[PDB]
Amino acid sequence: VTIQPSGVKDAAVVLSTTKTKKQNAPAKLYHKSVMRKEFRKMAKAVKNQVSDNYYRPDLTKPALARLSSVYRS
Amino acid sequence: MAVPLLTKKIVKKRVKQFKRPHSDRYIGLKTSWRRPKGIDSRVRRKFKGCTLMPNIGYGSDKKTRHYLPNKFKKFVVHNVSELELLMMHNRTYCAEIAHNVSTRKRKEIVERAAQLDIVVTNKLARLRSQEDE
Amino acid sequence: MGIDLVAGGRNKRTKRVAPKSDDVYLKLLVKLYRFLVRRTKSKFNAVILKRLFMSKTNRPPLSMRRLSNFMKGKEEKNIAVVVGTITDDMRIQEVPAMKVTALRFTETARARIINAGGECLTFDQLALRAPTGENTILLRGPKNAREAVRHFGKAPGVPHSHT
Amino acid sequence: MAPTSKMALGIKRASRSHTYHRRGLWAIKAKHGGALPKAEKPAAIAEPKFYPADDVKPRTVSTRKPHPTKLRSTITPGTVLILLAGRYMGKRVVFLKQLQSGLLLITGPFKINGVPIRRVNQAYVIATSTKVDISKVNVQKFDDKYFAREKKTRAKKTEGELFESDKEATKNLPDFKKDDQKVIDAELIKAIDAVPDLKNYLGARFSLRDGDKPHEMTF
RNA sequence: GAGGGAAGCGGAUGGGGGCCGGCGCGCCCCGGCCGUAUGCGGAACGGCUCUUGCUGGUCCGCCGCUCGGCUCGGGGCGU
RNA sequence: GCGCCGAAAGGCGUGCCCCUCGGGGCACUGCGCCAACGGGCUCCCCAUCCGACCCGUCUUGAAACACGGACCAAGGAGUCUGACAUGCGUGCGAGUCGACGGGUUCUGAAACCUGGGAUGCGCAAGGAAGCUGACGAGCGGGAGGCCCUCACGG
RNA sequence: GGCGCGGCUGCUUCGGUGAGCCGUGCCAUCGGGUGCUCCAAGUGGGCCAUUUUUGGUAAGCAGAACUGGCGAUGCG
RNA sequence: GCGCUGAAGCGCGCGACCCACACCCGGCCAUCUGGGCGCCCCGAUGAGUAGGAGGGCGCGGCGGCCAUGCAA
RNA sequence: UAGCAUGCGACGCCGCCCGCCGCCCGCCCCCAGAGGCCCGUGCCAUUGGC
């Protein structure tokens, strides 16, 4: 379930990441994209600034890394 | 910490094994434990050699509770979806594939789990669908 | 060991979140008080909490009359804390003002107090704007009143002498 | 109580001195405690961990305290150990392990063709002049590089150094053989001569390493 | 499993035998891939305001201009 | 632990004072946080104890020479709702309370709107029966605010 | 709890007194072993020991008192 | 019980020992003291028939949610 | 009278035995009113003159 934002791991381009929020009653956003391990850190450290507490977003970085490792071989 | 707590339930036990009393001398009379109900009962009298009765103090340490002896926490996995959560745990948790899940289904879970880096019970059971020594 | 100490295990255990509060909105309110209570000066909110857990033998109707004589301007129109509910039973042209706070009011009581003065406040808006809970009168019961203490059973029950 | 009174009687006193040397240098050890230290890439996770530093430093010290002390109760050097008896000169062994006192493992090298090693309740050992800081622990059985010969030439130098003392000292030579025969052992007389070490100990230290890790052993 | 010389609520408690399921780190060289800053071009966001507006996103498409890194394996070393 | 020597342990800043010998106690910033080496369970037997069967019941007291069972699988006991009294909870709250009809879908169901049956228990009572029928007060303990004056406190 | 001030009252001579009441001010070896309300239980047949008994030759009797235990309490 | 006798009887003194689940100590389970952030922590008492009071396990069919199945 | 199952003796002793030994694989683990190998290599253990 939602709070006001979510952040749910998947994606299926070979090499992929997922970085969702949700915000506001109509807009109903949810983006998925990226490759690289650096760009994985960065646009979740920025997400931390605009939200809070390191440990969960940080964890949902190698979940993705392991998925983008797996989709190689 | 954990290692010691795991060892305090597993190598001590308690394995008396609480069997119903005199279950052995009638076959039908079932193994499942029943409280010795009536006054003369020696077990009821809560004697030693009489086999201990169940009470709360007998209980394991919480830190060691519902763990496999491996000390991994088992999580039952119906399908691939449960796998995501398990993957997060990885180190913490072991995945156990339900008996029901079918042979055609079982394959996808197994491979996904490895990629997840949650090798546990599942490997054993997949060689168990293959045949084998 | 002692026997004293066993009797010491036999004190209470009053303790209760009530079996259900089916209202979720009451159900959240009743928790809020243990976070806020040890985190402010508010003894009153800590009392309301016990009395909105435990019982129906405890939950109060308060009439507009039973506010009305009893608030009477000499603790000068403070905030009146009614744990359970207000009920509509008086006509005087009622209260001299008033900020009344309760779990529930009837709609007639809501209408009559706000057209006399002040506000019929809800307890949560009270917790927000009066978090200290001081200048406040805990007013009151009942189930403790005339009808019914032990006056049960059929035709009762009596002063007593016999029953 | 007699050792333990001495510790008290500042409190700290040297540890009140310690600060000072930093105070003397100039103005300091608040800034350096707060401002430092490292960090920031990394991979994953909580970083719950660990070691080197500060606790470890009392645990090594603490572990050093039986270690003299058990020798004060039982008297001697430490390891490395020589056959007194047997062959007049001959060769050198190190006490890697106690099954017990008495049942002991005495050691060496073997990497190509090799060398034995014995576990004994005895046969032939009295100690020398070296000390380490272990008691009598290391083992399984490992060593090797030059060292049937080196350990052994290290033996010759100790066997010369000993053989002269065995001439000066003994009751004679025949029950230095009964002393060597014993090998529990121990208390009575220990410290004769054999001066100095500096090589003997360096050699012993290598021997301990060699009966440790990481060579010849890994798959 | 055990046995034709030693005593019994048939269990308990201890021990042997018999049976069985399970089984990484630091550095360097080669191969591989990609890159941001800035200019372009497209786009969810945000603090907030709440008629409305101002500053602040991030990634992608993909060329230019500097200047670098990662990952799967292999080879050595140290842990 | 946070400078140096010293393998090691240990000392190396300085002031005070007692002893006035060896020495002693006493005083003087913050901050951070180990070594070595390479299994479960079933049945049996021996030791040891429960041990007095169990078990359940009856009983002051059960191994019981008190009662009941050959052994097992399956069956085999707080049900139904009314009244009267309650506990716990929730909606409205000096009334609340809805059948039956009709209106209308799905459904043999049922639902929803609505007149609102039915007129309880209430809203105040007494008593054979006439018939009658106010609500003001504190006192004490002891919730809590204010005045103050704030160490207390009245 | 004690005192004073002030009103009202009583019983017992158109007689003597306090007490009561209200109002107002003043001054004063333990340690939760604990109160109240609703609803429910087996009962509503005991035993023994110790102490004190009464009957009875006595009794592993009968029948009380005061208490600790068994019942419903393991373990040594 | 074997069974002792200037004791393995008896009495008067005495020394050292043994021996419970007691008491201590270590670690842990309920309730309660409470405390602090749906969760963690400090200490105490803590046998049990009749039995009250409270939390939970399992059965079978129903509904909404949510899956599993050619090997249930 | 009974009585080798007190875990006994003797006499008489025989489709392949068993008498005496090479080489290997399991169980318990002194007498005694104080006492119980000459020259050597070799850390060892092996191994040689005697």
TrEMBL record, chain C:
Database matches in InterPro entries: Ribosomal_eL18, Ribosomal_eL18/eL18-A/B/_CS, Ribosomal_uL15/eL18, Ribosomal_uL15/eL18_sf
Stretches assigned to the Large ribosomal subunit protein uL15/eL18 domain: 2-163
Keywords: Ribonucleoprotein, Ribosomal protein
Family listed: Belongs to the eukaryotic ribosomal protein eL18 family.
Single GO BP term: translation
Gene3D superfamilies (UniProt xref): 3.100.10.10
An example Gene Ontology CC term for this record: ribosome
Name this polypeptide is given: Ribosomal protein L18
UniProt-listed Pfam families: Ribosomal_L18
GO molecular function: structural constituent of ribosome
From TrEMBL, chain D:
Record GO biological process: translation
Molecular-function GO terms, alphabetical: structural constituent of ribosome
InterPro entries in the record: 60S_ribosomal_eL6, Rib_uL2_dom2, Ribosomal_eL6_CS, Ribosomal_eL6_KOW, Translation_prot_SH3-like_sf
Keyword RNA-binding found: no
Gene Ontology CC: one annotated term: ribonucleoprotein complex
Keyword Zinc in record: no
Gene3D superfamilies: 2.30.30.30
Pfam families associated with the record: Ribosomal_L6e (PF01159)
CDD domains the UniProt entry points to: KOW_RPL6
Keywords on record: Ribonucleoprotein, Ribosomal protein
Family membership: Belongs to the eukaryotic ribosomal protein eL6 family.
Protein name stated in the entry: 60S ribosomal protein L6
Highest classification ranks of the organism: Eukaryota, Viridiplantae, Streptophyta, Embryophyta, Tracheophyta
